[PDB]
Amino acid sequence: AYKVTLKTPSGDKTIECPADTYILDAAEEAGLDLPYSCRAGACSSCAGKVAAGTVDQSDQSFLDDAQMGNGFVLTCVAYPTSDCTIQTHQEEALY
Amino acid sequence: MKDFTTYLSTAPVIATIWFTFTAGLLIEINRYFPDPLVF
Amino acid sequence: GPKRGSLVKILRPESYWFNQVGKVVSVDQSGVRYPVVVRFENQNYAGVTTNNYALDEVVAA
Amino acid sequence: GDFLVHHAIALGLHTTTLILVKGALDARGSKLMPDKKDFGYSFPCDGPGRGGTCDISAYDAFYLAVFWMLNTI
Amino acid sequence: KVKIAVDRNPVETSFEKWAKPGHFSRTLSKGPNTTTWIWNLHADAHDFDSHTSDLEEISRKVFSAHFGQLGIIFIWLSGMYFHGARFSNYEAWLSDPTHIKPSAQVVWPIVGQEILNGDVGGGFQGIQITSGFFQLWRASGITSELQLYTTAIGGLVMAAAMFFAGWFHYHKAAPKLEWFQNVESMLNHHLGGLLGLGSLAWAGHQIHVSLPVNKLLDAGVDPKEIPLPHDLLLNRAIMADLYPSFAKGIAPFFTLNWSEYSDFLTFKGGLNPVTGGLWLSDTAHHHVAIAVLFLVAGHMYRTNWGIGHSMKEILEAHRGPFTGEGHVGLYEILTTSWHAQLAINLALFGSLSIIVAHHMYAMPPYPYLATDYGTQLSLFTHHTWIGGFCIVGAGAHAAIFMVRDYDPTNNYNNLLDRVIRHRDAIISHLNWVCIFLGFHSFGLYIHNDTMSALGRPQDMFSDTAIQLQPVFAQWIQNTHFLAPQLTAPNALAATSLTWGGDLVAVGGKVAMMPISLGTSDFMVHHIHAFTIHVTVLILLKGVLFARSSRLIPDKANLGFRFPCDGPGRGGTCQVSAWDHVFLGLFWMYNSLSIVIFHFSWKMQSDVWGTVTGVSHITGGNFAQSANTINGWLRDFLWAQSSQVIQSYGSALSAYGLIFLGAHFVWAFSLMFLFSGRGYWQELIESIVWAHNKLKVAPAIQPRALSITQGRAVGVAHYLLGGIATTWSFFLARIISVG
Amino acid sequence: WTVPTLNPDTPSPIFGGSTGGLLRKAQTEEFYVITWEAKKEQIFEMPTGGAAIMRQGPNLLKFGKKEQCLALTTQLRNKFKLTPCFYRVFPDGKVQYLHPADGVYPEKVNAGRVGANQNMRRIGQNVNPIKVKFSGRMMSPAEI
Amino acid sequence: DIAGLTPCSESKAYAKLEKKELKTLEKRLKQYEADSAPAVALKATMERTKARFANYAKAGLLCGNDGLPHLIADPGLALKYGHAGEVFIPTFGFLYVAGYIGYVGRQYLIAVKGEAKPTDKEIIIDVPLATKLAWQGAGWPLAAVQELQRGTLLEKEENITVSPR
Amino acid sequence: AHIVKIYDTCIGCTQCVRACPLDVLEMVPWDGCKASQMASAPRTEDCVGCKRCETACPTDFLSVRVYLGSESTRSMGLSY
Ligand code: CLA
Ligand SMILES: CC1=C(C/C=C(\C)CCC[C@H](C)CCC[C@H](C)CCCC(C)C)C(=O)c2ccccc2C1=O
Ligand code: SF4
Ligand code: SF4
């Protein structure tokens, strides 16, 4: 599994997330309550920002390459591919 | 080599070769046994 | 309700996967009218493979 | 030749009937459009969304069946 | 600073991606879920702009693509020469080009295709080729099928070389963008070397090979009797025998006494009457002139030294008052968009091919070619079609550029800009003029047929009735007829008999005669004009409003090809420049079909036939039947239909076969043309219910085609059926009657 | 925030004048005008076709339809992050410089926005048109 | 005979059009040498014609006023008058091979539906499994009737339906 | 004038509002969905029915549905 350090408005919380599990799903299974709505990669509700490490969000449809190049990630459809640090609740910073 | 084997196991080439095989079958059939009507 | 990863049959008529089976990703414990989260393997005519559902629209099958 | 043409006639009958019954019966709704009845017997199209709605009304279906009928006659 | 810039081992070589569909593109690389995946995969395989964004890599891709293209063409030519060497009667037809039909294709003794190996003369059993390879090779002077054997072999080798070239230049060493951009260098290189050298070498081969051997041919010596070409090259004795200028070798050329060389650089004009081909002396003079021209031409632009020119500089210089920035920045544009150069070259090339066919039937160069009425007609129609399609492809890729690479920020007030401004007035005037043209030119024939059915032929528009005589064309014809007197004192004969004069006869067949022009021809010319104007109209609309419109202010945002923007606000059906070029295909086919009809009938009626007077094929009926569409249909179509509609039991029976089959497929297209993908997907859902009812659904989700894809399938099949129907009809008719 | 007004005396951006311009409908029924202040001077593209240069700060342009100004707002808001405010004007001279005029922008939730035309229900819960029969006009079931 | 159809082994127009054919043949033939490939081919063609005709006559085909063979469609009639060799056996062979191919198709289809990569087996194929099912597919009819007696062929009422059924 | 309707399945991802080229849509507070946001059409008389909303709603049945109605000059998108 990958250690995902979530930098949240409540502080940092490092969770373990399997390679086959979406970031958002793992966070919820760990008891966290991150934002979401569509859960289908088609909106900005679940946006985070990757500070370090890599994700695979290939099925997402809402973000452009420059947004992803700056680290933005739709946590509902993103798998970790390394230990990573992700600031949560980033929707406002996307706009 | 294995890449090549996979390329041959790709679909349209397989469809191709099977069709070629069948067609050559039937053409040779008519060659050696011309003018079939009954039986 | 049903468990995550579990397999349920969809019964919502207006759904693409109606009369078919899906996999419960999760179910919300809040007051949402449709807490069941169920993936699918075939995509709809929209290409989506997961939809939200109330408890009745699905059945553990 | 008469055998043959008679079989052709039966063919055309079946084709016409097929398209006609399809159109008439799917009028209430469809998998693509369950609410087909909400658009009346005659609506232009639901547009190009969902891959493209072209000639989707039962009115359109009868519209098509015309040609087959003409061919048969 | 022009030089060579390359990158070594850029691309590797493995069959890995070969096992990976869609790897070139992002989305397709994800694999198929529904059926359109395969379609789009195929569709975008060669859209290198869609592939990536590297101009340089895209240049390298298209470079290797051209490599492979050339290799394909090499393969084809080589196989042609191979089958010419092995399965032909070319040597028989050499012994007698007057009563042996060129045939190079033999079929196998099977269920009944064997009947088609008809009798073309010389105990040969095959199919008459209308390509004219025979006359080609005779003009080039090929004698032994061994020569064609060698030819095909070398072609195989060349093709292999070209394909290796593509491979190397893509994976081993691929040049760099600036190298691709050294444009003036490329121009000078090509302009001088390629064309000048090719023409000059062809002239040398002519002089030292063909002119001697063709001279002996028309002298009448047996083909297997002439000495060998290299033997001729060895022995200047026989060359001086043929033309004593060769006794002096080349020193006269070095003394500028060209007059002496006149033995082989003539200016006769006209055809060799005993052959019907152009005067080979005149041909060689032509080609050497072309050679010198392009050679001196290829030294125009600066590459690495102070002398030369700057395309950019001159284009910026050329600006007029009414025009603002004139020709500025276009340099930047052309240096950047592939589709720009593409569309340019396509339009130019189509126009060329048209002119090629024109001059070719105008003054046939090949031995006894004019006699082969079928070959004439066939090659002509062929190249005409090719040219028109090149035109529409030009329009296509031009619109493509305008969608993709366009940028306002660099073109502020240029020709392009003011065009974009007053496009509405432009297109308006164009509409009006096309409507007037159609009205008048069509109603002429219609009023004729109307008076006819009304029994008032006195009131028609005929060369006998109310006339429209192309005084212009006839005056110009006579002008060319009288030109050599003074405007060309060193001339012997006009370039064409149709300027006026006598008739040339080879083997009874009408080789060439002067052609008059009646009110009928007036009308048909105006028809053609109107049709072409419609085509340019639809194309111009498509390209001008490809990015926007008062209806769609954001059309540039919907990509080049796109089905519609809904049924909203009335209905957005068929609103892409893609659709526009689609329509253009239609109107073009219409145009060129009309033109070839005109050509065929006028030929048959007032040109071709057999000399005795002239036994004209249709006896000039065209002259009085063409004014009325009833005469058209009956006397041309209904009449010449017999050959095809009774060709059965003959070797030509396949002509009627394919005739009916083309009818079939052309009608088959119409279901696509009219149907609806929504209806189709509905049927899909029904049938997949039927299948799943037996657990026989396919994994890949079956999907009805896109609106665009259905349009394309339909139009392809439609044009195919039409062209094939016409092709069959023409072939059977001419093989029967000529 | 408060509704702004329109100033007809605004230096309109730099453009050479096109032919895709306004028509009778402007002088007859209505026409819209767009108001925005650019941070700098810069060239841009005309939605109705053409390249134009905006001035520093106050810039003004008028149009007939709404979609023109809407697409233009998209272009500027996503390419230069400007917050224009365009109105609805009539040959009367009455303005309503309104097209997204609503304090902020609608793409974000905002207090005060009262829901409208919102069927507080599913869509499958609609009734057969056999019941909307013999009404005062063609009325859809979903109308209710 | 049947429907007033005389055998072309008896009919006149049969031999008439046969001779006419051979006449056209010799006509095209009379423009060559003897050893010429075209000559020998036309001769072989005449041979093939006469042989096919002798076979058709031996087949006992009822061939009417055209002298051309017309076929009968009744099990009882064909059996009673010795004419099964024209429709019965052909139809039977056809249905055999067709059911074979369809059955083995469904066999591979089920095998690959029992996979994790349905699309990938739909594109790239399992060569040896294909060969195996091909070898085994002969017993397709017995297998199918077994599964019928077990009622295991058809899918139950769970396939997707349209909302108005 | 065309007709447009919102349904409880609105997950408020606004793509509809994000898609309407005519601003005939907007988002409001809500509590039915996690987003607490409901789509809203206050300017229907401007919708030309180009349905790009309907295209954009990711909702199983489209949280929003368009219904073409009568024709006004604005409904037809005429600038003349
Ligand atoms: C597709 C429908 C069809 C049709 C139109 C015919 C037509 C015919 N059949 Mg029947 N037949 C059929 C299918 C059909 N058959 C099939 C599939 C079988 C296989 C079991 C048979 C087996 C069969 C036999 C064994 C005989 C006929 C006979 C006949 C002929 C006279 C009796 C009659 O009118 O039967 C009407 C057709 C039907 C009722 C269709 C259903 C057929 C069932 C399965 C069997 C019918 C047997 C028949 C009643 C026997 C009558 C004998 C007669 C001497 C009294 C007549 C040409 C008799 C014959 O040759 O007369 C010259 C005869 O002896 N048929
Ligand atoms: C008939 C028709 C269809 C239905 C036909 C379709 C979609 C084409 C089907 C193509 C083939 C037959 C399906 C693919 C078959 C696979 C390759 C499976 C293997 C088959 C073997 C024989 C190779 C449309 O979808 C359509 C859409 C828009 C305008 C017109 C039409 C139209 O006319
Ligand atoms: S119908 Fe057209 S105007 Fe209305 S919301 Fe949908 S896209 Fe926007
Ligand atoms: S209609 Fe769809 S995209 Fe629009 S707000 Fe509702 S859920 Fe979001």
Ligand code: FES
């Ligand atoms: S919740 Fe919509 S993209 Fe993740």
